[PDB]
Amino acid sequence: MLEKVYVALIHYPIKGKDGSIISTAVTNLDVHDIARTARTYNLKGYYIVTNLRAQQDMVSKMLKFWREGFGSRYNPSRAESLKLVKLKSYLEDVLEDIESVEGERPLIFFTSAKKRENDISFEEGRRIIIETEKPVLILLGTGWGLPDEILEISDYVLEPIRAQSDFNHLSVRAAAAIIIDRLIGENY
Amino acid sequence: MLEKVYVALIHYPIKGKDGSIISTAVTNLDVHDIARTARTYNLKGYYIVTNLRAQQDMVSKMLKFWREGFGSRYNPSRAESLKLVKLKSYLEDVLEDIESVEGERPLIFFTSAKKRENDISFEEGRRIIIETEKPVLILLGTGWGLPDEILEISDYVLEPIRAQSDFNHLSVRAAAAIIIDRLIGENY
Ligand SMILES: C[S@@+](CC[C@H](N)C(=O)[O-])C[C@H]1O[C@@H](n2cnc3c(N)ncnc32)[C@H](O)[C@@H]1O
Ligand SMILES: C[S@@+](CC[C@H](N)C(=O)[O-])C[C@H]1O[C@@H](n2cnc3c(N)ncnc32)[C@H](O)[C@@H]1O
């Protein structure tokens, strides 16, 4: 059900340009942007996943500015949307947290512009979320996309958005928005 | 039809916090982000509308870096998506440009998180785009939203995304993504 859906923005492990594994910087706008989308569709949590202590520090400081500091008193909803945000160092820590919260490890939905074998449609994904009592975790990449090691542990790969177009390389913010709208939509 | 749809990001006239009319800075990521969304869904053009010469200069320089300069040789598709981008000083200049291109002034679709009287659903909007031979222009706001003077000249107001939610204050990048997916979707 729609009150048990999570999203995670992955910064490590991430594919580099030579796809080697890299660890990306967190772009500040990604935190605010995807938090607002998650909040709008009543998702349970938004995880920012990064093993870079400099990034963890920047995100933590930013979070308390907007959640506790001056920022929390001149927005309203920066802070409302940002309450959903949790920082974690690794995907495994995300999985462990959801298991603690939900009593159960989540179904993992891999996302990619690049067509994979054995994927599901968004209609098929919506059906799963409707019919399941399991928590669902939507994974979003940075850099040059989510790596094979994460693909290997994903339960489902959602088909690419606009797979038959001549161009479908969306930002992660635009992709997240569309993915969440297709899966949750105007259902309350 | 889907090969005659435009999007414009409005920075002036825009509602300020006291909603007074203000002129907003163009956030660089908005140019790249919404260009990719427009390109993915095969929209005809993406207008960046700003009457601030400092903003027009920053955007122009950025455009040629990615379209002509070094940027054009180490992406592929930054430059592909950015080809859709046109800078204009005023909404009127956008309308005038589309009239020159299409032989006809466009139908204007106003967008807002805030519920208005006399709006259309996305289903109703999709129908218009399917059945029309007129160009369509989707307007997106910055700051605290599109002002009444722009509302007054809009042919249609699309209903808010997630109007019945307790929170629907999306970023313009996330909103644009969802609006475009709802109107165009997986239609080729
Ligand atoms: C490759 S990353 C980096 C993209 C870009 N450089 C940016 O500024 O965000 C984009 C991420 O968004 C998601 N994404 C982008 N396009 C998508 C599509 N067409 N279908 C499904 N997911 C997509 C995937 O999760 C992907 O890992
Ligand atoms: C008010 S502006 C500024 C929002 C935010 N400060 C940002 O960083 O983008 C957001 C714009 O995105 C569009 N928008 C946002 N939420 C929307 C919604 N729920 N339904 C339709 N359009 C929306 C509107 O065009 C609006 O003018």
Side-chain angles (χ1 to χ4, degrees):
Chain A
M1 268 309 282
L2 326 171
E3 290 274 339
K4 220 142 77 174
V5 172
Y6 296 91
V7 60
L9 188 57
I10 307 296
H11 302 83
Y12 172 88
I14 281 303
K15 278 157 66 179
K17 209 168 192 163
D18 68 345
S20 87
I21 297 306
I22 66 163
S23 184
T24 61
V26 179
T27 113
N28 175 59
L29 257 63
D30 280 359
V31 184
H32 301 96
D33 189 297
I34 295 165
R36 284 173 184 278
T37 300
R39 184 64 186 83
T40 297
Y41 289 84
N42 303 98
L43 307 202
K44 201 151 179 197
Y46 170 29
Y47 292 88
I48 296 291
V49 181
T50 175
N51 66 333
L52 292 168
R53 68 192 317 279
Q55 300 305 312
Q56 296 168 321
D57 187 56
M58 173 272 140
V59 182
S60 295
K61 289 193 189 317
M62 179 264 292
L63 254 15
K64 67 158 64 184
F65 179 87
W66 295 106
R67 259 139 51 152
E68 165 187 290
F70 175 63
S72 66
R73 310 226 184 271
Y74 86 99
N75 263 277
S77 355
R78 202 63 75 78
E80 181 55 33
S81 61
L82 288 177
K83 71 180 185 174
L84 262 28
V85 182
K86 284 189 162 178
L87 267 162
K88 291 289 169 182
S89 312
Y90 304 98
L91 177 48
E92 177 56 28
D93 299 340
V94 176
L95 302 179
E96 175 197 326
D97 192 50
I98 297 165
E99 174 154 41
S100 278
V101 169
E102 305 291 351
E104 161 159 41
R105 265 165 128 78
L107 296 171
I108 295 171
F109 287 60
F110 185 98
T111 67
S112 181
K114 181 179 91 179
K115 184 75 175 167
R116 256 80 182 197
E117 59 301 327
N118 299 346
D119 64 3
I120 57 160
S121 62
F122 285 89
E123 170 175 343
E124 284 160 357
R126 198 174 310 122
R127 185 161 272 263
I128 291 160
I129 295 165
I130 297 311
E131 70 196 352
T132 195
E133 291 293 321
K134 296 179 189 175
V136 165
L137 175 61
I138 302 162
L139 299 183
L140 309 157
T142 58
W144 289 262
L146 293 165
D148 287 351
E149 62 190 279
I150 284 173
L151 179 61
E152 288 307 299
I153 59 106
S154 297
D155 299 278
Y156 298 103
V157 169
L158 286 169
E159 63 180 6
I161 294 159
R162 294 282 294 182
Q164 292 87 13
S165 179
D166 57 346
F167 187 100
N168 76 340
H169 296 297
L170 297 164
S171 83
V172 69
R173 302 161 296 269
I178 292 162
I179 288 153
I180 291 166
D181 191 59
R182 291 186 174 188
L183 297 177
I184 314 299
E186 294 294 327
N187 299 114
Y188 299 91
Chain B
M1 268 309 282
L2 326 171
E3 290 274 339
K4 220 142 77 174
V5 172
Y6 296 91
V7 60
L9 188 57
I10 307 296
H11 302 83
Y12 172 88
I14 281 303
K15 278 157 66 179
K17 209 168 192 163
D18 68 345
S20 87
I21 297 306
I22 66 163
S23 184
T24 61
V26 179
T27 113
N28 175 59
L29 257 63
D30 280 359
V31 184
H32 301 96
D33 189 297
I34 295 165
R36 284 173 184 278
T37 300
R39 184 64 186 83
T40 297
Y41 289 84
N42 303 98
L43 307 202
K44 201 151 179 197
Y46 170 29
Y47 292 88
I48 296 291
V49 181
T50 175
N51 66 333
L52 292 168
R53 68 192 317 279
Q55 300 305 312
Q56 296 168 321
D57 187 56
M58 173 272 140
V59 182
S60 295
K61 289 193 189 317
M62 179 264 292
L63 254 15
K64 67 158 64 184
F65 179 87
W66 295 106
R67 259 139 51 152
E68 165 187 290
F70 175 63
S72 66
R73 310 226 184 271
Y74 86 99
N75 263 277
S77 355
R78 202 63 75 78
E80 181 55 33
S81 61
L82 288 177
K83 71 180 185 174
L84 262 28
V85 182
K86 284 189 162 178
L87 267 162
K88 291 289 169 182
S89 312
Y90 304 98
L91 177 48
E92 177 56 28
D93 299 340
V94 176
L95 302 179
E96 175 197 326
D97 192 50
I98 297 165
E99 174 154 41
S100 278
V101 169
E102 305 291 351
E104 161 159 41
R105 265 165 128 78
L107 296 171
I108 295 171
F109 287 60
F110 185 98
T111 67
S112 181
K114 181 179 91 179
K115 184 75 175 167
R116 256 80 182 197
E117 59 301 327
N118 299 346
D119 64 3
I120 57 160
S121 62
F122 285 89
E123 170 175 343
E124 284 160 357
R126 198 174 310 122
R127 185 161 272 263
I128 291 160
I129 295 165
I130 297 311
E131 70 196 352
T132 195
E133 291 293 321
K134 296 179 189 175
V136 165
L137 175 61
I138 302 162
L139 299 183
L140 309 157
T142 58
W144 289 262
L146 293 165
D148 287 351
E149 62 190 279
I150 284 173
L151 179 61
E152 288 307 299
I153 59 106
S154 297
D155 299 278
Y156 298 103
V157 169
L158 286 169
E159 63 180 6
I161 294 159
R162 294 282 294 182
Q164 292 87 13
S165 179
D166 57 346
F167 187 100
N168 76 340
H169 296 297
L170 297 164
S171 83
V172 69
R173 302 161 296 269
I178 292 162
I179 288 153
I180 291 166
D181 191 59
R182 291 186 174 188
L183 297 177
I184 314 299
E186 294 294 327
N187 299 114
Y188 299 91

